[PDB]
Every structure is written in structure tokens, then in C-alpha cells.
Amino acid sequence: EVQLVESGGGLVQPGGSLRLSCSASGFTFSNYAMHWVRQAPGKGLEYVSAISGNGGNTYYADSVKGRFSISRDNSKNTLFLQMSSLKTEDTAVYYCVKGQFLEWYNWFDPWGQGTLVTVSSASTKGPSVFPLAPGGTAALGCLVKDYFPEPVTVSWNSGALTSGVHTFPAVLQSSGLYSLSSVVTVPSSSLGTQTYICNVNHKPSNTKVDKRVEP
Amino acid sequence: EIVMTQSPATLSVSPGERATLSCRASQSVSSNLAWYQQKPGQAPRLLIYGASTRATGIPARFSGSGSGTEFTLTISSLQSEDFAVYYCQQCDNWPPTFGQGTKVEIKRTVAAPSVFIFPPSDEQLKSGTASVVCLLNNFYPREAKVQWKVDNALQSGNSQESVTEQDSKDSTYSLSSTLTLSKADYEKHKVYACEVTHQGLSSPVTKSFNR
């Protein structure tokens, strides 16, 4: 089976540079044009760049032309995207994508899993975790505030509590930091007797918090 | 540059019924059109190429049709996995362009949200900011309006919200809205209220607390 695996994504400042890699397997890499496509969080798909099978022809969307560079190593079956002259608007998941034999007027198949590039002036840091404090049903939760960059994971009771949990997409605040809420509905009669803990892990900052939420 | 326009923006379909998605190109691209499926948090995958050829491994219930400027993706009996976002892409012009996507969601009966309001914690107040959170839990359809009032003053520009993906079990949505105030501002006022408008509610519901 054909597999495409991107690496190299992460946080970078405007005025920095970043190199993405895509490792290809399961096909004769040098016989095929390759491409990059990106997707800003919550937005649609935007074509980025093309490279012919032997690397002799390259094409760039006007949005990245003069700033990004595409290249390929056919001996190592790798495709690259060099990102320079960066803008915050370059924040996106970047997808490696397999083309056909000639590079023009291709469709894209298959796609890599994607790698998230965050272009921002903000610096890495872990969240503060605040309680959303609570014979019927009650709601409680955790406010995972002021972290950067994405992503964060949230579980409840070390994974023992899954029913009724909603963990919301983060919002990007005007500060440049992210904020997310995770909630769960539980029996009102349990609020003072059952222990409810939200397990927050922010890998980019190596920050983990276990927060009990009580009335 | 060929402009691709998909319609509708969101298609609500009962499980087992047919879904028909439209894609229009601003010029003729013959049969040079592809369709992609993207499930939340996943990469897109190819469904259709050459307007009507199904990619390997794609179920038979997906079929593409059309030529020239008008194309159709037909999903003949929506299975649970099939609810996703669908993009078209012309494979004819040398700036490749995509449609903006059609979201296919499960249609179910109207369900009113349960609404909860959360004051800021004393811990957060110690650092000088107050977040007030309003939760709209397990409602359908997705359209809902949250209005924040602080001592009856409608808050505009002070809040952000987001919405979960459609729930796999009950096909509902949930929404969280955060109102941000400084500590000094939070302590100037007493009544904090979120008012929720939704098709499932005969009149707007308000949840509030006094600081």
C-alpha cells in the first residue's frame, strides 16, 4: 500500500523558517508528480505547490510564491517543503499528496496524515486549569486557559468517565493563546460524593494537570 | 482561475436516505473533476476522479456525475461513516482550485439545549481576569444564539464560542461560549446572564447568577 508520512511541523515565529518532510513508500516515487496542499484550522483546502517526477519543473500558488520552495530526493523517496518569509496566515495543517505521471491538472491521492505548522509570535506555554463548578442532571467542567500552541488532550477520571463528556474546539484568543473547555453532565446527587477529575495534557509544554472539580 | 462553488453549505439527511451534492465550475472542465471526503480530524481522501470514476476501496454508494460546469456527488444510502465534509476540485486548470466544501450531517428531530452558566473561579480571579462560561448541551439543529448580559447590558465583542462535532450517539451538537472581563470589571457588576435562542425552545431561556 502507498503511504505518505509528513514530519517537521510545529511552532515557528514570523521571520523564521521551517522545513517539512514527507516520506513516501509503496510506489515508484520518481515516476510521479508530487504536491503540497494546506488547510487553515476550520477552513477549506488550499493548493500550495507542485513538483515534477524528476524535480525539473516546480509550481507555486501565488500565496506562497517567492517564499516557499519545493524539492524532492528521489534516492531517499522524500518530498520537502521549505517555508521562509513566513506569515501568521501560513498557520495550517500541511498535507503531502501524490499526483500522477505528468504534474499538470492532477488529482491528489493518497494524502499524508498532515503536520500542523503554527506561525505566531506567541511562545510555548502550558495551560492554567480552572473549575467550571456545578434528583436530576448537573454539568461541571474544566476551563483549560491560556496555552500555546495546539494541541491539548483532556480526559475525565483517567479515562473512566466518557459518557456525557464534551471537549470543545479551542478558540484562539486576542492574546495569541488558546483556551478550551471540557464539560460533563453527571447526576446531581453525585456532585458532593463522587470525585470528578479532568486530566489535561499539553505535550508542547510538557504540562500535565489533574484537576478535581467540586461544588 | 476557475472558481468552484459547492451547494448547499450544509446538507441534512436522515440515515439511509440519499444525499446529492452540487459542484459548479465557472468554466467547462469537461470530465476533469475530483471529489474528496474529509472526516473531522482526518486527512481528505479521494472519492471520485474523472468526474465519475470511483477510487479503489470507496463504497459503491458513492457515485459522481456531470460534465462541463455542473457536477454531482450522490451518496445513495447514508451510512454512519458517510457524514463528513465533501470537497470538489477541478483537474483542468493550472491553478488547482477547490470548492469550499459541503458538510453532510445527520437529520434528527428538534432537541432543545440544556443550558448551564458557570461563574469565574476564585483561583482565576486572583490573576486579574474573569471567564464566565455558558454551556448549551445536546441540541439540534446546530443553529443557536447566545446573548450575554451583565446587569442587563448586552455584551458585544467580549465573547468567543465553539461547537462540538455532531455526536455519534444522539446526533446532537453542544456549544460553549466564554465571556471575558477584567477582574475589576467583573467586581463592578452583579447579575451575569446568558440567554439562549433555539428552535427547540418556545421562548428564550436565561441562566444567571449573582456574583
Side-chain angles (χ1 to χ4, degrees), chain A, chain B residues 1-206 208-211:
Chain A
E1 187 50 270
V2 169
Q3 302 276 100
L4 304 173
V5 182
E6 303 92 336
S7 53
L11 171 61
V12 61
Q13 314 214 287
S17 71
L18 194 70
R19 185 167 189 83
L20 311 186
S21 298
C22 166
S23 169
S25 60
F27 65 105
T28 306
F29 180 71
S30 59
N31 281 343
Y32 290 89
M34 301 292 302
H35 316 253
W36 293 93
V37 177
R38 70 185 181 177
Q39 183 172 45
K43 300 308 200 321
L45 302 168
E46 180 184 19
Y47 184 85
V48 179
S49 181
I51 187 163
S52 65
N54 71 0
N57 308 329
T58 59
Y59 170 79
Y60 303 98
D62 285 342
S63 61
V64 302
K65 185 175 172 186
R67 314 188 299 111
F68 293 3
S69 328
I70 190 168
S71 67
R72 67 192 297 154
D73 185 338
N74 286 346
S75 65
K76 289 165 110 169
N77 281 8
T78 311
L79 173 78
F80 305 94
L81 187 67
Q82 184 67 49
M83 308 174 65
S84 188
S85 295
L86 302 174
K87 309 172 170 184
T88 61
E89 294 79 8
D90 296 325
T91 295
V93 172
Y94 285 76
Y95 295 106
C96 182
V97 129
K98 170 170 130 31
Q100 290 77 64
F101 307 112
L102 298 169
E103 67 268 27
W104 39 90
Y105 324 142
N106 281 194
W107 63 87
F108 310 125
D109 175 48
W111 299 55
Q113 89 285 347
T115 188
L116 177 62
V117 175
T118 301
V119 185
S120 172
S121 291
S123 33
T124 299
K125 69 135 142 172
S128 293
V129 183
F130 301 120
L132 302 168
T137 295
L140 61 88
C142 284
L143 178 60
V144 179
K145 191 156 156 47
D146 285 351
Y147 68 92
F148 188 84
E150 292 274 49
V152 289
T153 62
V154 181
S155 62
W156 285 89
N157 291 352
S158 291
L161 175 51
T162 60
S163 186
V165 178
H166 295 305
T167 294
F168 288 89
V171 291
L172 179 57
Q173 304 168 115
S174 63
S175 61
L177 307 176
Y178 295 92
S179 182
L180 164 158
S181 70
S182 185
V183 301
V184 61
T185 50
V186 299
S188 305
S189 58
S190 70
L191 291 179
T193 75
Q194 169 72 47
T195 295
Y196 295 102
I197 294 158
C198 72
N199 323 106
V200 176
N201 191 356
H202 184 240
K203 308 214 174 188
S205 70
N206 194 29
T207 298
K208 286 183 297 187
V209 172
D210 297 313
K211 173 76 185 192
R212 184 183 185 191
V213 180
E214 294 176 86
Chain B
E1 192 226 47
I2 309 189
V3 167
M4 310 302 299
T5 301
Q6 296 183 247
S7 65
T10 295
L11 184 54
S12 298
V13 192
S14 320
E17 278 170 357
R18 166 196 263 206
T20 77
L21 296 66
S22 297
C23 169
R24 181 183 64 253
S26 62
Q27 343 171 1
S28 180
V29 296
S30 315
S31 291
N32 283 16
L33 191 100
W35 290 92
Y36 304 90
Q37 179 194 59
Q38 183 173 40
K39 298 166 178 178
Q42 285 188 60
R45 60 164 186 172
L46 175 71
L47 298 171
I48 299 289
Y49 57 106
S52 53
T53 297
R54 211 169 55 246
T56 70
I58 302 305
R61 62 183 181 274
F62 295 92
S63 73
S65 293
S67 44
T69 62
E70 289 296 343
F71 303 89
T72 298
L73 183 69
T74 299
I75 313 172
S76 71
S77 177
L78 268 278
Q79 307 203 353
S80 58
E81 319 87 40
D82 297 344
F83 296 96
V85 180
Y86 295 87
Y87 294 98
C88 68
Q89 175 235 330
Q90 54 88 10
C91 310
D92 190 277
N93 216 248
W94 193 210
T97 47
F98 296 86
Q100 87 303 331
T102 290
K103 184 185 91 168
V104 179
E105 58 132 37
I106 316 163
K107 185 155 45 176
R108 57 149 291 159
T109 60
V110 170
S114 46
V115 182
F116 308 84
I117 187 168
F118 298 103
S121 65
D122 293 341
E123 182 189 353
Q124 186 192 14
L125 286 173
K126 295 186 194 309
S127 51
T129 304
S131 302
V132 192
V133 176
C134 191
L135 166 64
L136 288 51
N137 186 75
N138 292 28
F139 60 94
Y140 184 87
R142 186 175 184 282
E143 311 88 65
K145 183 210 290 173
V146 167
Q147 287 190 317
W148 285 105
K149 304 188 100 184
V150 182
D151 286 336
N152 300 288
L154 178 54
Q155 303 296 299
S156 175
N158 298 130
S159 59
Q160 296 185 276
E161 63 176 40
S162 73
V163 179
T164 51
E165 298 295 329
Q166 194 166 33
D167 180 78
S168 59
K169 276 152 167 47
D170 65 4
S171 298
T172 66
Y173 295 92
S174 293
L175 178 160
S176 170
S177 180
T178 304
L179 176 75
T180 304
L181 300 189
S182 67
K183 179 194 174 208
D185 269 352
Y186 175 72
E187 301 181 322
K188 277 172 187 157
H189 307 277
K190 199 229 279 191
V191 184
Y192 290 80
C194 55
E195 180 207 62
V196 170
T197 303
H198 187 265
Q199 187 187 338
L201 302 170
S202 57
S203 59
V205 302
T206 296
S208 60
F209 64 92
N210 302 328
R211 172 182 48 89

